[PDB]
Amino acid sequence: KRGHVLAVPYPTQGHITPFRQFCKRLHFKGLKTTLALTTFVFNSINPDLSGPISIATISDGYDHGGFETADSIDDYLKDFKTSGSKTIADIIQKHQTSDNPITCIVYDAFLPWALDVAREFGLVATPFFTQPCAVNYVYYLSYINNGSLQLPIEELPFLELQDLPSFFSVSGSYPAYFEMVLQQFINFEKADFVLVNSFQELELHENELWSKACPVLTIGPTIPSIYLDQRIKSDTGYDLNLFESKDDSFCINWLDTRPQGSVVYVAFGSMAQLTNVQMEELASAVSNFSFLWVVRSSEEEKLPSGFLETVNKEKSLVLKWSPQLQVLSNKAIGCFLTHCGWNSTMEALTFGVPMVAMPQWTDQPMNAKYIQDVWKAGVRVKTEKESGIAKREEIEFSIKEVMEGERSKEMKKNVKKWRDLAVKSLNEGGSTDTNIDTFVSRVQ
Ligand SMILES: O=c1ccn([C@@H]2O[C@H](COP(=O)(O)OP(=O)(O)O)[C@@H](O)[C@H]2O)c(=O)[nH]1
Ligand SMILES: *[C@@H]1O[C@H](CO)[C@@H](O)[C@H](O[C@@H]2O[C@H](CO)[C@@H](O)[C@H](O)[C@H]2O)[C@H]1O
Ligand SMILES: *[C@@H]1O[C@H](CO)[C@@H](O)[C@H](O)[C@H]1O
Ligand SMILES: O=C(O)c1ccccc1Br
């Protein structure tokens, strides 16, 4: 009972959730964990604090308003390193006299500066990569090559420019984020271990490649235990949400009244914004189906005028936020029109829901390439090269490819092989269970 992990996610939903899920696994294995949330995120959730995972607050330098009150991404990341370094140190110091002092920092790989704090205090230090091995390996090759990528990549020759992370195909876009994803590797060799939110059997070749450069430990998927291995019965869902849902049994009750495989689920995660023009092509394409579409509140204005009040309440539903795990497990879902965020992707793969891939930016084009041509679990929507927009007829065609065709019948069979592979990996003797055991042993 000696070890104590302080877990520091990048402060977005897609990073907080896999960190929190990993903490529930460590707790089941007997390791105490404290999750570090920024003050702004803490004061927006109002989390429940009678749980097996404690919460500490740190500062990114923007406690009042959060990221949206920062001038720029570069200012934000630099203030986060300043304020985060000082406030992580503060948490460590505050726990020193305690029964269980902090012994280990599991920090988001996006934040390599946390390793320096961990090393100043003599702690175990491990970066946690929330993106899959293939993406991280590609970023690692570019970091080694001063930020450039010569296609083709000898070890992954099937990758084309349009399959790379958007930083490589959209020149100069988001330079602060591009620098951040490359600098994940500035010191990762010096960590005790390198953790990855994936499972070995999903990316055998890429995991093998990346491990030659640095031993990594796959400890995923971070899907709650009740849906896969079921060894942790208290792990029944995602219980740290930055977005409010209208308590929606209403959403799952509505899907219960629908025929099997008949509903098109559409969602673009927590962050990605589509333009007016892209929302128009989408709204038109999906209106040819029974659909369940999450449109985030801030995105509603970009819908075509009067769209929300001409959804026929019998076949279709538009939500502000969904219980996506429960949706993706419901039998009424025929396919998942997704932006290919890695959590939505792994959730789709493991629930056996075939995908329509509409990637937007950072690593999503990679996940989209793997969904279609490696895991063969869906089709990527075609976007016009000059305009960059996926037009309504191309979106409707891709959904039909996944719902009905001969392609369709194949991608169903292929996507259900992955649930069992993950269950095996999380069960005793599996790849992920052993790797988590190795990490727990080192921490205590
Ligand atoms: O309406 C929604 C949309 C997304 N999610 C969850 O939010 C996470 C989104 O993470 P992902 O890596 O897919 O995308 P990001 O939001 O980081 O771009 C996932 O755990 C989804 O299940 C949800 O619960 N309800
Ligand atoms: C990364 O930069 C982009 C802007 O290019 C931001 O959208 C993102 O900020 C996140 O926004 C989310 C709201 O949709 C918040 O949940 C999250 O806390 C915040 O970090 C930047 O991180
Ligand atoms: C950065 O750019 C993408 C568009 O390519 C958008 O989806 C994100 O919302 C934005 O932060
Ligand atoms: O890679 C991601 O998904 C990501 C998430 C949040 C903020 C920045 C990025 Br670049």
Numbering used by the authors: 4 to 447
Quote the original article.
In UGT74F1, glucose is transferred to the hydroxyl of SA, creating a glucoside; in UGT74F2, glucose is transferred to the carboxylate group of SA to create a glucose ester. UGT74F2 exhibits the GT-B fold with ligands bound in the cleft between the two domains –the N-terminal domain is comprised of residues 1–245, while 246–449 make up the C-terminal domain. UDP and SA interact primarily with residues in the C- and N-terminal domain, respectively.
Collection of an anomalous X-ray diffraction set showed a single anomalous peak in the SA binding pocket. While there is partial overlap between 2-BA and SA binding sites, the location of the carboxyl group of 2-BA differs from that of SA and is within hydrogen bond interaction from Thr 365. Therefore, we propose that SA binds to UGT74F2 primarily in the conformation described for the UDP/SA complex (i.e. carboxyl group of SA interacting with His 18 and Thr 15) but binds to UGT74F1 primarily in the conformation modeled on the basis of 2-BA in the 2-BA/UDP complexes of UGT74F2 wild-type or T15S (i.e. SA hydroxyl interacting with His 18 and SA carboxyl interacting with Thr 365).
